[PDB]
């Protein structure tokens, strides 16, 4: 009995998957197909980015091929439907019909921006699975799941819902969507990141009781956004996302509650740390907007993440994402037999099932109107 788990964004280092790329015919077909598509559509090589990790990359729009590539960039849009009244769609890039080049810029390497790490990570995981499958090592009834981005790579590997060219295209898009989702103001520095919190490394705590309380009360009367976004290991690993200001506040508060030993197993106990939040916010609200997260007693910063994924911040655009997925996931490629009872989504930690109860549970967690009408007229016979 086998389960395959696909990891999400994290430490994506230079040269990952390249050892397998040199020896495996199956891995070569995965990379070469995607590299050709990137070179023809966007004028860059994902293989070059993985192997060399350049600090900057310029795309030239010189000739007829260059002008075709430029129009591909110009069509890339960002939709955030139900932003107040209705759509407030915009354009990803400052590229216009008179532009002759565009430069991607980074601090120490472009295999750290989410538009390049996400396709690179998806490719290395797809190539590894394709090489495992080419050696007859994949059991027929294996269950699978993926962590954040790994979920999308798992679906493309075990269910084949997309081609390689479509997969990398719709990962590069929605990689650039998040690259512009946060207001990077002056030096491309939006105050957003993630920290891994070990609630047991500080004191007695819980999954959604003690650590979650210091996060929900610091977001309900302070007006800021801090959320627990990953429930990874019970009592030992929880990832918080939000303002880079609030992450420093949380790590300092947890360090001070470690140094000042407390035992917890209004204003008495319920509001005591509410007063703690009030006093910690004053030293925090005056913090300069940019900062670098430091390892603390319970909090270790996540290197490589700059977008508050899995939080309510990225909730205005979920339906434009929903509409984008409908045009790129063809109904004829779904193959429910490869999903039923074997795929465990992150949203619902339950095996995939096409049943009324499964739809009801998804509705009881998202409130999607299409799911609601499906439930209402479930007599689809």
């Amino acid at each position: 009995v086998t389960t395959f788990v696909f990891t999400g964004q994290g430490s994506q280092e230079q040269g990952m998957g390249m050892d397998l790329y040199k020896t495996s015919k199956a891995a070569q077909d995965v990379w070469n197909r995607a590299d050709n598509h990137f070179k023809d559509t966007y004028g860059f090589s994902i293989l070059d980015i993985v192997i060399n990790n350049p600090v900057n990359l310029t795309i030239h729009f010189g000739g007829e091929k260059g002008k075709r590539i430029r129009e591909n960039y110009s069509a890339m849009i960002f939709e955030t439907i139900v932003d107040g009244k209705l759509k407030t769609e915009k354009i990803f890039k400052e590229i216009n019909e008179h532009s002759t080049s565009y430069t991607f810029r980074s601090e120490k390497g472009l295999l750290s921006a989410t538009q390049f790490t996400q396709p690179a990570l998806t490719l290395m995981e797809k190539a590894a699975f394709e090489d495992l499958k080419s050696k007859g090592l994949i059991p027929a009834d294996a269950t699978f799941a993926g962590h954040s981005l790994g979920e999308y790579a798992a679906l493309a590997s075990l269910a084949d819902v997309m081609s390689i060219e479509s997969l990398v295209e719709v990962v590069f898009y929605r990689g650039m969507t998040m690259q512009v989702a946060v207001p990077r103001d002056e030096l491309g520095r939006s105050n957003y990141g993630m920290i891994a919190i070990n609630p047991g490394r500080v004191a007695a705590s819980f999954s959604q009781e003690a650590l979650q309380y210091v996060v929900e009360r610091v977001g309900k009367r302070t007006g800021w956004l801090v959320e627990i976004v990953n429930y990874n290991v019970e009592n030992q690993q929880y990832v918080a996302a939000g303002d880079l200001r609030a992450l420093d506040t949380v790590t300092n508060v947890l360090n001070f509650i470690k140094l000042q030993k407390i035992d917890i197993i209004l204003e008495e106990v319920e509001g005591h740390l509410f007063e703690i939040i009030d006093e910690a916010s004053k030293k925090s609200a005056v913090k300069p907007r940019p900062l670098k997260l430091e390892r603390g007693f319970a909090c270790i910063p996540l290197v490589g993440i700059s977008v508050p994924f899995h939080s309510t911040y990225l909730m205005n655009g979920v339906k434009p994402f929903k509409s984008f997925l409908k045009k790129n996931i063809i109904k004829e490629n779904v193959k429910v037999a490869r999903l039923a009872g074997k795929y465990i989504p992150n949203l619902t930690a339950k095996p995939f099932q096409v049943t009324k109860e499964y739809f009801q549970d998804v509705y009881d967690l998202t409130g999607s109107e299409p799911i609601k009408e499906i439930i209402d007229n479930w007599e689809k016979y």
Binding site: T7, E125, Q236
Partner: protein
């Protein structure tokens, strides 16, 4: 259910799952409870460049299921593609 209405429902359920995934908390604690407890998985294979998920499955297997694995005599194997290549590919060192 004809295997075309079921396909349509599966498509328009997968779409919503993936659309709301990136804006909702990742329930990995309950996910690994599914395949470690409900499925009694013997081989957990992590696909990726580092043993991130494998490490956190091993931590889950010590925090819980320690007594559960002993009583049922389960031999769990946690293999990361990046380091356990010999065990995954069945190429033992002679």
């Amino acid at each position: 259910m004809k295997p075309e209405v079921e396909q349509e429902l599966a498509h328009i359920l997968l779409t919503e799952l993936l659309a709301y995934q990136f804006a909702s908390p990742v329930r990995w604690i309950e996910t690994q409870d599914v395949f470690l407890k409900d499925f009694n998985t013997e081989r957990v294979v992590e696909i990726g460049p580092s043993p991130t998920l494998a490490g956190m499955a091993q931590r889950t297997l010590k925090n819980k299921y320690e007594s559960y694995d002993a009583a049922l005599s389960l031999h769990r194997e946690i293999l990361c593609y990046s380091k356990d290549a010999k065990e995954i590919y069945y190429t033992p060192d002679p």
